[PDB]
């Protein structure tokens, strides 16, 4: 005979918990329910963790087609739909793998995709943009900027963000330079100068499009400078790659983090606790 505890379980699992046996309505059906900010809560005891919306299927294509077909800079697409540049780049990478599967005549997980997307909140981009997908201007809290400092200054001083950055340290930058899309500040400054919105967007596009050109240039010069140091000498069996380097960069005592060579005067750390023996980087 079932115990009392199990009997109570199946009792709750039949009347109150029967709403989770199947997902009939579209949207989240979590236990915590809708919160004060209109976001479901998967755990009632933890109100801070909310189920955030995920990019709808049709929305993922809009982002992909804009960056590929129209060739717009990722920064512009990130600021248009309020999607992080790190997410926009992932949507394209994942979408390119779909083209490969569709090109290779591979069967997609369509039955699993449709059912799961009905359990999560979505944000359809385009016309019906109720709220921004996420915050694209989130700044990382630097450890230096977390200190409680009360600097004594003149009673009539104009303490700006630049001065505050110098108070935390000499090599620190203000939040105006730590943004992922700094072209927005320049765009907002145009709205203060009674500039037509039609022109304010034009300058923004040219700004982002110009920055991506620079970044693409540095990358090209970098990769080209890394291959100039590799002299490939093909052989009968393999290809020997001789990478050049400076044998004098070992520091003033031979201890340099970037030095090349198996360091001397150190035994094997294999018997140390918490020693990592797993690949830390899969290129």
């Amino acid at each position: 005979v079932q115990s009392v505890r199990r009997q109570k379980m199946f009792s709750w699992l039949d009347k109150k918990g029967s709403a989770y046996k199947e997902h009939t309505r579209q949207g989240p059906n979590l236990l915590g329910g809708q919160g004060k900010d209109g976001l479901a809560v998967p755990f009632p005891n933890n109100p801070y963790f909310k189920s955030q919306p995920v990019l709808s299927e049709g929305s993922r294509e809009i982002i992909y087609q804009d960056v590929m077909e129209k060739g717009l800079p990722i920064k512009a697409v990130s600021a248009k739909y309020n999607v992080d540049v790190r997410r926009v780049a992932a949507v394209i990478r994942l979408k390119e793998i779909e083209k490969r599967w569709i090109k290779e005549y591979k069967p997609l997980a369509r039955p699993y995709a449709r059912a799961v997307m009905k359990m999560l909140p979505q944000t359809v981009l385009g016309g019906p943009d109720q709220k921004p997908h996420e915050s694209i201007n989130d700044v990382h809290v630097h450890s230096y900027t977390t200190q409680q400092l009360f600097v004594p200054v003149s009673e009539s001083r104009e303490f700006t963000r630049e001065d505050a950055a110098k108070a935390f340290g000499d090599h620190i930058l203000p939040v105006d330079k730590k943004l992922r899309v700094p072209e927005l500040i320049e765009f907002q400054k145009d709205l203060l100068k009674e500039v037509p919105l039609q022109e304010a967007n034009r300058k923004f596009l040219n700004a982002t499009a110009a920055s991506e050109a620079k970044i693409a240039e540095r990358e090209a010069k970098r990769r080209q400078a890394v291959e100039d140091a590799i002299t490939r000498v093909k052989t009968d069996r393999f290809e020997f790659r001789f990478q050049e380097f400076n044998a004098e960069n070992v520091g003033h005592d031979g201890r340099d983090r970037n030095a090349v060579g198996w360091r001397y005067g150190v035994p094997f750390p294999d018997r140390k606790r918490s020693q990592i023996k797993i690949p830390t980087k899969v290129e």
Binding site: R86, E96, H142, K178, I215, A259
Partner: protein, 60 residues
């Protein structure tokens, strides 16, 4: 170049992060390397780099 970067690698789309966006603490690397000996005197221009020096010490 050998082959194009596929969409699987994280280098398919380069999105450089802004300055001071991480604080990774790398450990101290034990061991040392021998300091290469200086071949030229710190001050002045040595004779080894002048023209014809090699031909004088290694004449055909």
């Amino acid at each position: 170049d050998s082959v194009s970067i596929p969409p699987d690698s994280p280098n398919y789309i380069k999105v450089p992060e802004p300055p001071q966006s991480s604080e990774v603490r790398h450990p101290f690397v034990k061991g040392h390397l021998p300091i290469p000996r200086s071949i030229f005197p710190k001050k002045g221009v040595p004779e080894k780099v002048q023209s014809g020096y090699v031909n004088r010490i290694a004449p055909k």
